[PDB]
Amino acid sequence: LALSLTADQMVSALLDAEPPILYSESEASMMGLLTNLADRELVHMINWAKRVPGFVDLTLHDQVHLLECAWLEILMIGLVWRSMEHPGKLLFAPNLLLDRNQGKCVEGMVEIFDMLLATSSRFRMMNLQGEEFVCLKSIILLNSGVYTFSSTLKSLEEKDHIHRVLDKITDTLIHLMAKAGLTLQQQHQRLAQLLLILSHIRHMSNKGMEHLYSMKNVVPLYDLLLEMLDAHRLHA
Amino acid sequence: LALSLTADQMVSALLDAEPPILYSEYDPTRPFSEASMMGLLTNLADRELVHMINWAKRVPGFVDLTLHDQVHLLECAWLEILMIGLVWRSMEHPGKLLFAPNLLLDRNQGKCVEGMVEIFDMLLATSSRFRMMNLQGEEFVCLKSIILLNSGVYTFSTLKSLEEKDHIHRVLDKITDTLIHLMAKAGLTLQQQHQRLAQLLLILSHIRHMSNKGMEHLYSMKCNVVPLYDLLLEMLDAHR
Ligand SMILES: Cc1cc2cc(O)ccc2c(Oc2ccc(O)cc2)c1-c1cccc(O)c1
Ligand SMILES: Cc1cc2cc(O)ccc2c(Oc2ccc(O)cc2)c1-c1cccc(O)c1
């Protein structure tokens, strides 16, 4: 049960859940390379989400909805995390490290680039830890769709569960900071600082979607995710 | 310097800073037919903007920033601030958005403007969420000031720039402390305090989202040569 895990068991489950770092397939279509990278990461994000404690307790519908809302925020927070020790650069993959003026190739990409670097600098200033990072990523998964669901009794029960798991991750975040020797005030301050960054990740994702949907296939992402989440039980 | 206020002094100063509740400019003898909602909401929003500027200048730490940084923070945050206000004053009216005391709308009347009902539904749910959390006015004013200080903080490398960011974050830390204090006085346990802080701050990300979609919806309508930065500066000259 996801709600009976301790803070240490929670951190431990999220670390264990971490997806692998994938590699990119001169400047070809840089958008080609990045889209191919994202598509391959999506698969591993599905496996990952299924290991976030609480997630597989939800309906298939709500699982898809959550990933459809959060997929870019999740990709972005991973990017920001990887790029943390590389100032002025975004490590999309170990073999695809781009700087600002490489961004000025796709129109509109520069604005998003600058925002991503700034978040990465912020994580670096705060010395964000891996254990904290995985907590934030899981919050993104669980939080980003919750407000834009139906309100059936089933749907109400689903929303209550999500808020219990989010409360457990908060618990876990606080436990980490205490385990790291911060004061209670410092803990509350750091918790606030990190959750406010989630607002900026949401903002970037929204601008990202605008940018991506400005470039005009017959395979909608919803359908894509459903197909991937809706696994059979034949391969035991 | 704002860094030396207590929680109650911070709480009290924000309460003191609260803007008034404006009304919709209404010919109430006139039919509702010959009256576009968007016009009413635009005129309401413009008049609120003036008061928002007055409020912002009384948020502790705000006037310590440069004029350039004050304008930028308001530039990024103004619609979120309008939204959180609408959500707060809509709490006691389930399924309805109190834009002004003489302008209460439901989802149906939202449907009259093309891409509006998406945003109404989102705003309604935010209002429902605040109602189920029993959000206090003391907490509300803290959240509203966090939006002001946080929303443009990443979109500003001069020595002054770093110092300015640094200052904004010290004040945010101060308002965080104030929120925890208020939850302590309400009788919440330490666990319950940090959970509630989290829950409240996670709602800020949904308010940002709604703000982003509101902006898409507004620019799908009107296409300003005069940038918003210039207008926010000019307003400070027009009415101050
Ligand atoms: C911001 C961002 C982060 C990414 C992180 C990844 O781990 C992988 C790809 C990323 C990525 O490119 C994508 C390209 C196509 C697509 O369907 C999904 C992502 C972007 C990105 C790049 C340029 C423009 C844009 O709006 C968004
Ligand atoms: C969401 C919202 C909240 C408002 C809160 C207020 O206190 C006053 C007006 C509001 C308001 O209408 C506006 C109209 C013009 C404009 O320049 C700013 C706001 C909206 C709103 C409504 C429908 C579409 C949209 O994009 C935005």
UniProtKB/Swiss-Prot annotation, chain B:
Residues 1-240 are annotated as: Self-association. It is linked to Estrogen resistance: A disorder characterized by partial or complete resistance to estrogens, in the presence of elevated estrogen serum levels. Clinical features include absence of the pubertal growth spurt, delayed bone maturation, unfused epiphyses, reduced bone mineral density, osteoporosis, continued growth into adulthood and very tall adult stature. Glucose intolerance, hyperinsulinemia and lipid abnormalities may also be present. The modification Phosphotyrosine is found at Y229. Phosphorylated by cyclin A/CDK2 and CK1. Phosphorylation probably enhances transcriptional activity. Self-association induces phosphorylation. Phosphorylated by LMTK3 in vitro. Composed of three domains: a modulating N-terminal domain, a DNA-binding domain and a C-terminal ligand-binding domain. The modulating domain, also known as A/B or AF-1 domain has a ligand-independent transactivation function. The C-terminus contains a ligand-dependent transactivation domain, also known as E/F or AF-2 domain which overlaps with the ligand binding domain. AF-1 and AF-2 activate transcription independently and synergistically and act in a promoter- and cell-specific manner. AF-1 seems to provide the major transactivation function in differentiated cells. The gene is ESR1. It is found in: Nucleus; Golgi apparatus; Cell membrane. Belongs to the nuclear hormone receptor family. NR3 subfamily. Binds DNA as a homodimer. Can form a heterodimer with ESR2. Interacts with FOXC2, MAP1S, SLC30A9, UBE1C and NCOA3 coactivator. Interacts with PELP1, the interaction is enhanced by 17-beta-estradiol, the interaction increases ESR1 transcriptional activity. Interacts with EP300; the interaction is estrogen-dependent and enhanced by CITED1. Interacts with CITED1; the interaction is estrogen-dependent. Interacts with NCOA5 and NCOA6 coactivators. Interacts with NCOA7; the interaction is a ligand-inducible. Interacts with PHB2, and UBE1C. Interacts with AKAP13. Interacts with CUEDC2. A lipid is attached at C142 (S-palmitoyl cysteine). This is Estrogen receptor. Residues 6-240 are annotated as: Transactivation AF-2. Residues 6-239 form the NR LBD domain. Residues 1-240 are annotated as: Interaction with AKAP13. 17beta-estradiol binds at E48, R89, H217. Nuclear hormone receptor. The steroid hormones and their receptors are involved in the regulation of eukaryotic gene expression and affect cellular proliferation and differentiation in target tissues. Ligand-dependent nuclear transactivation involves either direct homodimer binding to a palindromic estrogen response element (ERE) sequence or association with other DNA-binding transcription factors, such as AP-1/c-Jun, c-Fos, ATF-2, Sp1 and Sp3, to mediate ERE-independent signaling. Widely expressed. Not expressed in the pituitary gland. Selective estrogen receptor modulators (SERMs), such as tamoxifen, raloxifene, toremifene, lasofoxifene, clomifene, femarelle and ormeloxifene, have tissue selective agonistic and antagonistic effects on the estrogen receptor (ER). They interfere with the ER association with coactivators or corepressors, mainly involving the AF-2 domain. Changing C142A: Loss of hormone binding capacity and temperature-sensitive loss in DNA-binding. Changing I81C: Loss of transmembrane localization, no effect on peripheral membrane localization. Impairs activation of estrogen-induced activation of NOS3 and production of nitric oxide. No effect on binding to ERES.
